[PDB]
Ligand binder design. Sequence first.
Ligand SMILES: CC(=O)N[C@H]1[C@H]([C@H](O)[C@H](O)CO)O[C@@](O[C@H]2[C@@H](O)[C@@H](CO)O[C@@H](O[C@H]3[C@H](O)[C@@H](O)[C@H](O)O[C@@H]3CO)[C@@H]2O)(C(=O)O)C[C@@H]1O
Ligand SMILES: [Ca+2]
Ligand SMILES: [Ca+2]
Ligand SMILES: [Ca+2]
Ligand SMILES: [Ca+2]
Ligand SMILES: [Ca+2]
Ligand SMILES: [Ca+2]
Lengths: 194, 201
Amino acid sequence: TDTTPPTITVPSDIIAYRGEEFEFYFEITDDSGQVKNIELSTFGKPLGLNWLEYSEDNFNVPGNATSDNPLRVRVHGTVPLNEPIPADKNRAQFTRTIRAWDAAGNVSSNITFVIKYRAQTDKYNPADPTITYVDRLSSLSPSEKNAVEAAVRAANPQIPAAARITVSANGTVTITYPDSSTDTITANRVVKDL
Amino acid sequence: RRATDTTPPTITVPSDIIAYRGEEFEFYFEITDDSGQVKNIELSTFGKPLGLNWLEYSEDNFNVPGNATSDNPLRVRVHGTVPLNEPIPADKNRAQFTRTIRAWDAAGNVSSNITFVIKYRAQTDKYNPADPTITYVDRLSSLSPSEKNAVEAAVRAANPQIPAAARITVSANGTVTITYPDSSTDTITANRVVKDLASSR
Ligand SMILES: CC(=O)N[C@H]1[C@H]([C@H](O)[C@H](O)CO)O[C@@](O[C@H]2[C@@H](O)[C@@H](CO)O[C@@H](O[C@H]3[C@H](O)[C@@H](O)[C@H](O)O[C@@H]3CO)[C@@H]2O)(C(=O)O)C[C@@H]1O
Ligand SMILES: [Ca+2]
Ligand SMILES: [Ca+2]
Ligand SMILES: [Ca+2]
Ligand SMILES: [Ca+2]
Ligand SMILES: [Ca+2]
Ligand SMILES: [Ca+2]
């Protein structure tokens, strides 16, 4: 008879960026070849992450969780755009647990997984724009600022369309991401004297 | 029939020359002579240097027989661009250059200088922005980056007549600034640009 609970592999680097959908997988195996169900919790208490969701496809089917072909549970969600980020980044995370059980009811211990979350600028790192030549490096014209923004945008299709690119009087570029975090492109990467 | 041409050419000048800074403009002088031939012209400041290096004209068809009759006058195309940052004083009407033109015929007769006036104005005198379609925002005092993008695109879409080189900026409360290439501006107040999304649903 089966007296051995399932075993769970969790991803080691779940990193989510505010306002951007993430996904990851748990992999569950049981010696019977069948996993019945799982539970996500805060060490047995309610999960408390209403923006997280996981698929229950293929739960409780014979052969759904063998060593060769484990049960792969897709988890996805979006950390809130305005989720506060602690000053200490080791605390900018949610530590949670998962347990699973087989058809005989053998339940695993609580296995820890950690969802780290970060500002969008930690994902983003703008690429170099083509240089814009300007008449005065300390006082860009409106047309030159338009050109600078266009060039930053053209070089960075991977940055959210919803990010706003602004240009200062000296050609310094600010990129403000939807979560209000920012990147800066120094003027020497952006403009040169005509 | 008189033995010689002693009559200088006759020049018609345009009456209302208006140029906007940074925008190419053009106007025409029309010149006739009793001989039918005009040799050349001079643009001056009452006989002094013109002192307007951005003013140009074509010498096409100059000094050609029949180039300047009453039926077919010599049409001289003058064109140029008033510099983007040409100073406009506190009195906008002082933003003008009074200059003079005369013309020679092929017999040595030169007309007496007559005046023409090039008025120049800021680009915002030419452009009147239409209000954008309203952008619906979550907080009227603190637009998001996507909402400012939307506002700018809405203003841009409602005003295709505005130059592409004009820069549209959007403040935290949705106040729009259109800064034309010559750095003159137009404003659209926030109440004509953004509305609260929740109250409008
Ligand atoms: C931007 C600006 O300040 N515009 C002025 C111009 C400029 O000062 C000048 O044209 C650029 O060189 O002067 C304006 O005044 C002139 C105007 O009153 C004309 C009238 O025909 O006369 C000029 O003085 C003449 C004078 O009439 C002649 O007798 C003399 O031989 O030459 C003088 C030199 O031009 C005035 O300067 C203008 O309209 O051009 C007024 C603008 O506000
Ligand atoms: Ca088992
Ligand atoms: Ca399977
Ligand atoms: Ca990074
Ligand atoms: Ca823009
Ligand atoms: Ca004559
Ligand atoms: Ca205007």
